[PDB]
Write an enzyme that holds these catalytic residues in place. Sequence first.
Site, mmCIF file in Angstrom:
data_model
loop_
_atom_site.group_PDB
_atom_site.id
_atom_site.type_symbol
_atom_site.label_atom_id
_atom_site.label_comp_id
_atom_site.label_asym_id
_atom_site.label_seq_id
_atom_site.Cartn_x
_atom_site.Cartn_y
_atom_site.Cartn_z
ATOM 1 N N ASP A 195 -3.431 24.609 39.602
ATOM 2 C CA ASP A 195 -4.495 23.750 40.091
ATOM 3 C C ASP A 195 -4.854 24.007 41.545
ATOM 4 O O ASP A 195 -4.207 23.505 42.476
ATOM 5 C CB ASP A 195 -4.122 22.283 39.929
ATOM 6 C CG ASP A 195 -5.299 21.373 40.193
ATOM 7 O OD1 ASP A 195 -6.376 21.887 40.581
ATOM 8 O OD2 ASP A 195 -5.143 20.148 40.071
ATOM 9 N N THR A 196 -5.899 24.796 41.742
ATOM 10 C CA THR A 196 -6.311 25.165 43.092
ATOM 11 C C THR A 196 -6.882 23.982 43.875
ATOM 12 O O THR A 196 -7.002 24.042 45.104
ATOM 13 C CB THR A 196 -7.356 26.255 43.057
ATOM 14 O OG1 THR A 196 -8.500 25.778 42.337
ATOM 15 C CG2 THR A 196 -6.805 27.504 42.365
ATOM 16 N N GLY A 197 -7.260 22.928 43.155
ATOM 17 C CA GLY A 197 -7.806 21.738 43.777
ATOM 18 C C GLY A 197 -6.730 20.767 44.241
ATOM 19 O O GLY A 197 -7.028 19.792 44.919
HETATM 20 C C1 LIG Z 1 -2.752 16.107 42.228
HETATM 21 C C2 LIG Z 1 -3.240 15.442 43.514
HETATM 22 C C3 LIG Z 1 -2.315 15.975 44.561
HETATM 23 C C4 LIG Z 1 -3.148 13.971 43.162
HETATM 24 N N1 LIG Z 1 -4.572 16.088 43.735
HETATM 25 C C5 LIG Z 1 -5.686 15.839 42.787
HETATM 26 O O1 LIG Z 1 -5.812 14.827 42.120
HETATM 27 C C6 LIG Z 1 -6.959 16.375 43.477
HETATM 28 C C7 LIG Z 1 -7.654 15.382 44.439
HETATM 29 C C8 LIG Z 1 -8.855 15.751 45.349
HETATM 30 C C9 LIG Z 1 -9.790 14.657 45.837
HETATM 31 C C10 LIG Z 1 -10.187 13.548 44.875
HETATM 32 C C11 LIG Z 1 -10.954 14.348 43.846
HETATM 33 C C12 LIG Z 1 -10.063 15.403 43.214
HETATM 34 C C13 LIG Z 1 -9.730 16.390 44.311
HETATM 35 C C14 LIG Z 1 -8.915 17.104 43.209
HETATM 36 N N2 LIG Z 1 -7.758 16.816 42.297
HETATM 37 C C15 LIG Z 1 -6.895 17.856 41.620
HETATM 38 C C16 LIG Z 1 -7.729 17.987 40.361
HETATM 39 O O2 LIG Z 1 -7.654 19.348 40.118
HETATM 40 C C17 LIG Z 1 -7.376 16.957 39.295
HETATM 41 C C18 LIG Z 1 -6.129 17.499 38.621
HETATM 42 C C19 LIG Z 1 -5.797 16.947 37.266
HETATM 43 C C20 LIG Z 1 -5.584 17.383 35.963
HETATM 44 C C21 LIG Z 1 -5.650 16.305 35.079
HETATM 45 C C22 LIG Z 1 -5.047 15.066 35.220
HETATM 46 C C23 LIG Z 1 -5.072 14.702 36.548
HETATM 47 C C24 LIG Z 1 -5.231 15.706 37.516
HETATM 48 N N3 LIG Z 1 -8.363 17.094 38.205
HETATM 49 C C25 LIG Z 1 -9.357 15.982 38.207
HETATM 50 O O3 LIG Z 1 -9.273 14.865 38.693
HETATM 51 C C26 LIG Z 1 -10.450 16.063 37.151
HETATM 52 C C27 LIG Z 1 -11.526 15.048 37.428
HETATM 53 C C28 LIG Z 1 -12.536 15.722 36.527
HETATM 54 N N4 LIG Z 1 -13.215 15.005 35.466
HETATM 55 O O4 LIG Z 1 -12.808 16.851 36.162
HETATM 56 N N5 LIG Z 1 -9.639 15.594 36.018
HETATM 57 C C29 LIG Z 1 -9.463 16.500 34.882
HETATM 58 O O5 LIG Z 1 -10.164 17.474 34.586
HETATM 59 C C30 LIG Z 1 -8.717 15.505 33.952
HETATM 60 C C31 LIG Z 1 -8.430 16.170 32.771
HETATM 61 C C32 LIG Z 1 -8.043 15.548 31.563
HETATM 62 C C33 LIG Z 1 -7.618 14.229 31.641
HETATM 63 C C34 LIG Z 1 -6.624 13.891 30.716
HETATM 64 C C35 LIG Z 1 -5.756 12.829 30.769
HETATM 65 C C36 LIG Z 1 -6.018 12.350 32.057
HETATM 66 C C37 LIG Z 1 -6.850 12.343 33.171
HETATM 67 C C38 LIG Z 1 -7.637 13.423 32.783
HETATM 68 N N6 LIG Z 1 -7.985 14.407 33.661
#
Ligand SMILES: CC(C)(C)NC(=O)[C@@H]1C[C@@H]2CCCC[C@@H]2CN1C[C@@H](O)[C@H](Cc1ccccc1)NC(=O)[C@H](CC(N)=O)NC(=O)c1ccc2ccccc2n1
Lengths: 99, 99
Positions: free
Chosen positions: A25-27
């Site tokens: 996860d590059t984000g």
């Molecule tokens: C892990 C943490 C350190 C908490 N970082 C992250 O949360 C950062 C925060 C930064 C600022 C707020 C906006 C997001 C950026 C990116 N994200 C990483 C980011 O890559 C985050 C990782 C991910 C995978 C899935 C479940 C949760 C987390 N993905 C996302 O939040 C995207 C939001 C989107 N609709 O596309 N979520 C997903 O694509 C997503 C996928 C499937 C799902 C299934 C069950 C649960 C929750 C669900 N999530």
Amino acid sequence: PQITLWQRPLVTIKIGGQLKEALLDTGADDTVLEEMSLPGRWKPKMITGIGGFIKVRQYDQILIEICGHKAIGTVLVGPTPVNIIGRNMLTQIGCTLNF
Amino acid sequence: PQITLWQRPLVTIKIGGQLKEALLDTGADDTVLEEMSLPGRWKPKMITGIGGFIKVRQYDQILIEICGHKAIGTVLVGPTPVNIIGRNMLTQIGCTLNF
Ligand SMILES: CC(C)(C)NC(=O)[C@@H]1C[C@@H]2CCCC[C@@H]2CN1C[C@@H](O)[C@H](Cc1ccccc1)NC(=O)[C@H](CC(N)=O)NC(=O)c1ccc2ccccc2n1
């Protein structure tokens, strides 16, 4: 490997001799894991994602193997739907985004 | 290009003729941007990541340039703390993870 993104970039990881899978996860700044057995003491911590803040358990100096590459660092255990490998680890295995 | 992950993989995007910057996010299924003006009709939607849900407006078949590369797809507009470019767009520019 060279990994396309038509599906979620999940890979095999190993921690404490346990085989798991996790999202490259590059984000993500940090590495956040599902409940699992880890050694040592943890400390409470709070991080945020797109939906707001969560409380996590912070473990330090954790050894992990990611698709065969060794990495060591801080991992956070908490209410994540999926193991996420964040940049703190991704850099250690030489991972890049390419286009 | 080849982008290392020592810092956040932020890049220039152009959408609605406006230049913004956004996070190249392999852990995100969707592309989610801060409040802005887009054409066409939208549908209400709720998405999740870490920490819970946010409500967004979903626009379809939206044109965006990502580091000079054209992509067309679904863009979600809402109260995200950071503009994120998810896999639905990253795949259109041939983005890969490499190590
Ligand atoms: C892990 C943490 C350190 C908490 N970082 C992250 O949360 C950062 C925060 C930064 C600022 C707020 C906006 C997001 C950026 C990116 N994200 C990483 C980011 O890559 C985050 C990782 C991910 C995978 C899935 C479940 C949760 C987390 N993905 C996302 O939040 C995207 C939001 C989107 N609709 O596309 N979520 C997903 O694509 C997503 C996928 C499937 C799902 C299934 C069950 C649960 C929750 C669900 N999530």
